[PDB]
Symmetry: D2
Subunit: 494 residues, 4 copies
């Protein structure tokens, strides 16, 4: 079951979080955060800029000083702290799920059973890594003892997007805190609220002051301030390929801070003629329409073998036509609103371009409600690789179906992209699955499934979909600085 | 192509190898080694017993002393020595393959292209591990620096069988020497010669005296002296399950030396009705008949789905009938003799049991030549799980074909065995492959192949097929002793 | 602060635990467990034997069947369950610490602050391993995809001693349950009660029935029935070297089950002349007298460099004379009774032995109280290597002080033992530390400290102190069975 | 023993190496490479620019195509090819060592015994890694089989400096080729010759055409063309911190290619009062003067405790005065010329700033010969933290000796730098070694030694000394792209 939501949850946190305290922006400015189901302002949030980020970095640097409580703390105790935080998130699960829906738009049942579940699982996974990420002892030549310490990278800037506000926070904080780093986090202007409440929980869980600092605000102000900061050791950025470029340039123009990026995708979902038809249809629908189409790794290029194309397309249309768009607090709602007006307008722009460039509009294609940012589930057929809707990330409920003949052809077409975040293969055949999974140029390849995330398995892009990995053991590599200690000994023996 | 063999290679090495020198046994007794193709004596070999083993162990212990050339040698240099040994074995490849064939009976072409190749690949793989098996630095609670050293286990007793004389030597020496151990090796009385010649090469490569010592002799004498020795730190045994028991009791009854065992099997090879028929028949032939049927992981229970049974059986009988038995130096020969008279008679015993118990004799079933230990390729059909030939390891050219209906049926019947060394699955279906590889209780599961060994991938038994793993990184564990060092420090920081 | 103890805690659990239920022995037999502070019977406990062990093994086998709740359970959820068990143990901490003291004799302040603390830390550490012990994907030669699965070893027999009842239970359950095994545990007849209570918490935590089964009873009966069982896949034993031999023999003579052993020690604690004297005296006292001397890694050979010998002895003797023996429920008490009458007598025998062979009695040497099993802290000076009290594990409050001159000498003397569990070095010198830590043949070497255990750092013996390691990542190896799956693929590419 | 050098070694390779063939630049332009001992031109070398870079990248890309010989080659065979290359460099060691000296300036004895030895060790180290860098099998939640593939990152741009021409090439090629990548290398204009000859050996070794491509030319042209190239997946740059910035900006401005950097340093060498005086003085001299002072991790800030300061400086001055500068082909020469006239002039410039700002010139200070770029071993005493010679990397034979009082003081001073490449500590004290190696913010900390490089131990910068690590297992991380494959399975079991 799912507990009944409070459909108008009280907001408690709306300021800058530095040193476990709440601060107005130095400018005293605030910006509104909007409910995308109604288009109405939820509340004002402090508008952090460069000066606020400066305060935050100083607090973070102080917390990181040798001999500080956070630096001296046992690695196992960092685990306990992460597990305490997860316990508190779970305590406030019903509230956070409802707030998540209020600010973002996603169905409450999904906030509750999916987003909040994944958040708990991620934080508890990483709690487990805290005292387990060993350095090495190394059999170097000569009369020496040589070993590596895995140290924290230090002051980590973390700039996150609005599509999974709580989950992306957890994906960042989990590996960073498990490895003893300190954080300055810039949350998305569209969805700052849940992350700020979680900051209260960080304080309650007992993290020392300055270990996690949150600065809500805009990208070119607060975000750029972090990426170009002289005393941020590392930046992790999740967002558009376009702003990823800005981040890497900022890093290089400033202090040569370490950089990881999780960017867009145009992920191919490949349906072989021997696929389980009903399963493949349902999963392709999910792969595209999940979270209002607002997923980095959305199955936005649906390649279907010619022999099953017609039936696949028929079945896909029926499912898109029966997908329930409405109030995200109604249990029956499958699809909420898009996150804001800019997104709403951009997706509608893409549907227009799709119609214009000769893609066959099979269903939807319009606005779904007269208030809030609701869009009809849209399916385009006979899509061609050169079409704008086949190339550009739409980030909306707009499905592309493309026809192919051969396994060799579809590999070339799938790989023909500057993106490489994810892909999938639907087939009953062992050799087809292995052929395709090895040939596909993508960070994750799903076989007879889609959007299967696990805290244990790494995720991240090939090509311009980003670099570095999040989740799994791999997710600790960007948060570790490696020191070699080589010691002269009287006589080295095996 | 394969170089022409010397069909009567000269024997240079036939004594006990200790401190890089050749010794008569202390009793001065010798035993004959026989050419299995003719039944004739090749030469006499020193008959090592307890006294000779005692000498060998003292030499190994001295070589292992803290501050010795072997203990002080750079880990990378152990790699250099292993690679040098591989180069010398390559230099003498034509000679060694022909000697292997003389003493063991396997086809010279197989000795050359298979055994010798796998030996080189194994030594060269482990050469690469020598300086790469790191200890750990560990984030323990409190003000401490904690780390582990991976030290050699020490003096390693290695008792090996006759079925792959050179490969079994390499499988044992590669990981032992990569990790800085010293060795007292007991070779099989049936096949002592190639391993003794390799000892000459170990000396030539530059290994310090005492690092590898070799005692040819019998099992209850030299073998048991090693297993029961008060100064041997570790024993690795490969052989029968019966002697495995003897070895583990000897270790328990002596100094609690560490034990690993590679023992027999009765490995199931499962052919689903969707398998590629031509491929499955050829691979099932190989799986069973490879090396005169003298393979620990022989596919000696061939389970075939009922819809393909008659055709599979027909094809299998034709393949067995075409199999050329003859002089192992003749390039046309596919099957040499069995290793000795004891094995010869045991295998004929098993065939007579097969017939008497109601299995269907479809081809072979008798002696194949009037000289040497040759047995016709023998196929039994309509084999039942309760039959002797379905349960006991035959270790000869005797194939069992069993009929089944369902996947759940075959899983349980395959698993209903006290052995679990290997298994194989032939199918085109992804889900059947995955279901079976998970469900099968065996150390290696091959999918659409058989007898695929890589130096990179571990190999070893479940259940009574033994314990521990050889090959890959895993092959190093049994040869490492772990030391934790925990050091008080002024102030631990992350 | 330590919560006031219930000095007469109620006993709730005194039966055989199988399938989450409490059972009498088939025989209906019960055995008294005694309070060592008073020599009085606490209560009677069900006396399990072969037939009860047979039921417990059948239940574990059932819980391990493919498709069972325990086998299908997400690894992450095994972590949640271990975490929940740690929470319940912490909830009942005050009760469990008092019950431990009642049955074992150790001071309540130590049960509470040390034993219980270490139990919680072990379980929480292994909770974190549950979903992180990865197998490997392997770049084998040829057109294959090769990988390994790390599967559970299966039905694990675990036989534990009486010196750290709750801790030894946790050391065994932690890694077995994290890796998905099932357990039949035989607890010590001297100290059954606390482990049985924890069984109640295993049920309360939500572990499926048959995952943990506990059989109280005696060694030659219940313990030997586990070791010889034909369906137990792995046995883990902690206790005497003497019984260790029996276990390895029983394993070899039965089904060749996998064995690990945690046995005795006679661990050298080396004090160099440049050591911090006050520290080294206090730590040498703790190293020996901790837990009534009943510790496998007790520093039972204290080697002191000659220039500081006289002062070190003077100070050690004053320290032993000041050690408070009495009621373990009194907060003033440093030392409680020995565990039982047998150990009491064995220690008195060793004390008389030291006097007979000429070691200098500096203090203690007698019975400390009328009731229970209390022995005076005893220090022997001028101990020589050849003496029985210098060679054999005493397991009581009996300290040996040996004098040495050189670092090279002391290495040789420290290593001249068939034991090799632990060692320590006290020195301010970098090179002396590194020289000694390298040269000492011991599973753990402490430097300027003693008895510093971390859940993160492995622990186990060299030589006749045992084999295999407990704690850390290494603790998982003995609980994992490795399966290679090697799959033919159309065309292997890097 | 060292073979007599050819002091005018012949030049065979001076063109652009693409597809295992030699090419003139598209422009037909050449640049002189100069002998720094004489100031005379050795020969002309093809001047590569963007058009030649483009030809090379297309070559690398083709060689990387799925199904090409290099992609399909067994990982173990990649290892064999690396070992073959090492064998060829060893065969040609005398020639290559003389060529290195001729083009670079370093003493022939050093080229031969140090650089060449290190090149061989690096390549043979990485040969061993080729088939051992496993991906993982991951116990993800749900009915899934999840695993990682460690794939090559792809086309690798490698831009290397002039100070260790052959070694830097090896450091780059070793890990890149072990993991199946393809390379476009830009060698330093000052030292192109040796790396070009090694390209001949790469062809001879049997590496498929296009796997390694080498473009000599200038930085703003050929190097920038590599960094900005839209089909280069990864760039690795070694050189100045200034140009490191340019690289990172170029990567984010183009295709968001993966970046690792090895930049400058101003490494502190800390001499505690309890240090071994003779050894510390010799090591501090080596630490600064190695390779004409042309070492990224040079001990260019020598901190000396005040109690030993006077003696230490006195001895350091005597040692620098006795250092032999001259013809690098003469066996008596310890120091050759600096690499070129720019470096020559820059160093004299720093010597002038040292005099101007009031540092105590103790010896040297000027040119050491009328021909070639020879500079006197120069020592400054009483150096202060604010001085230019204490802050900026000089990259010449100019030693800075600074005085300190306390361990706490020197930590702060050592860490007060935007560099963090290496540091060293000289002390006999265990606690001081541990305290310092932990507190020092440097990629490598040497204790009682300096410039101890091992192929096994990673090396790289903290802060603006760069990012990522080379050597050891860590050196493979930047050359790997991680793919997750997650497969729906019928029913997941442990
Ligand atoms: N110039 C910038 N520098 C740093 N961060 C930015 C910049 N612009 C936007 N951001 C931030 O990056 C995150 C990802 O959003 P963004 O890439 O702008 O996606 P979109 O523009 O499609 O909404 C957000 O938190 C946003 O505030
Ligand atoms: N023959 C045996 N087989 C199996 N377990 C035994 C045997 N004898 C004793 N045990 C058990 O092993 C554990 C350790 O005991 P042991 O090594 O005998 O120490 P002690 O005799 O000094 O108490 C206890 O649980 C004990 O009951
Ligand atoms: Na919003
Ligand atoms: Na023979
Ligand atoms: Na008791
Ligand atoms: Na030059």
């Amino acid at each position: 079951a799912v507990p009944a939501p409070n459909q108008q949850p009280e907001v408690f946190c709306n300021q800058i979080f530095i040193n476990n305290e709440w601060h107005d922006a130095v400018s005293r400015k605030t910006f509104p955060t909007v409910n995308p189901s109604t288009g109405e302002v939820i509340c004002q949030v402090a508008e952090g800029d460069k000066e606020d980020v400066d305060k935050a970095v100083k607090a973070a640097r102080a917390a990181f000083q040798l001999g500080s409580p956070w630096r001296r703390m046992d690695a196992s105790h960092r685990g306990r702290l992460l597990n305490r935080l997860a316990d508190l998130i779970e305590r406030d699960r019903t509230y956070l799920a409802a707030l998540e829906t209020l600010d973002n738009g996603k169905p409450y049942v999904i906030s509750y059973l999916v987003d909040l579940d994944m958040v708990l699982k991620c934080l508890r996974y990483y709690a487990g890594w805290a005292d387990k990420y060993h350095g090495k002892t190394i059999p170097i030549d000569g009369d020496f003892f040589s070993y590596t310490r895995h140290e924290p990278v230090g002051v980590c800037g973390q700039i996150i997007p609005w599509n999974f506000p709580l989950l992306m926070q957890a994906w960042k904080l989990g590996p960073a805190l498990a490895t003893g780093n300190v954080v300055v986090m810039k949350v998305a202007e569209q969805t700052p609220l849940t992350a700020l409440y979680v900051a209260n929980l960080i304080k309650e869980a007992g993290f020392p002051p300055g270990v996690v600092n949150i600065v809500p605000g805009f990208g070119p102000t607060a975000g750029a301030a972090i990426a170009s900061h002289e005393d941020v050791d590392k930046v992790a950025f999740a967002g558009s390929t376009e702003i990823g470029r800005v981040i890497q340039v900022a890093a290089g123009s400033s202090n040569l801070k370490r950089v990881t990026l999780e960017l867009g995708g145009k992920s191919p979902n490949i349906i072989m003629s021997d696929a389980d038809m009903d399963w493949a249809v349902e999963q392709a629908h999910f792969a595209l329409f999940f979270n209002q189409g607002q997923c980095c790794c959305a199955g936005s290029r649906t390649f279907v073998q010619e022999d099953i194309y017609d039936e696949f397309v028929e079945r896909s249309v029926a499912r898109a036509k029966s997908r329930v768009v409405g109030n995200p607090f109604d249990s029956k709602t499958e699809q909420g609103p898009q996150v804001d007006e800019t997104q709403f307008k951009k997706i509608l722009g893409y549907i227009n371009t799709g119609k214009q460039e000769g893609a066959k509009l099979l269903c939807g294609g319009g606005i779904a409600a007269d208030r809030g940012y609701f869009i009809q589930p849209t399916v385009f057929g006979d899509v061609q690789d050169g079409m704008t809707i086949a190339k550009e990330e739409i980030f909306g409920p707009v499905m592309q179906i493309l026809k192919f003949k051969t396994i060799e052809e579809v590999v070339g077409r799938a790989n023909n992209s500057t993106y490489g975040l994810a892909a999938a293969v639907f087939t009953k055949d062992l050799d087809k699955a292995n052929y395709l999974s090895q040939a596909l140029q993508a960070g994750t390849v799903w076989v007879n499934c889609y959007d299967v995330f696990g805290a244990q398995s790494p995720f991240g892009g090939y090509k311009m979909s980003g670099s570095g990995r999040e989740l799994g053991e791999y997710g600790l590599q960007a948060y570790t600085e490696v020191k070699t200690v080589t010691v002269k000994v009287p006589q080295k023996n095996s």
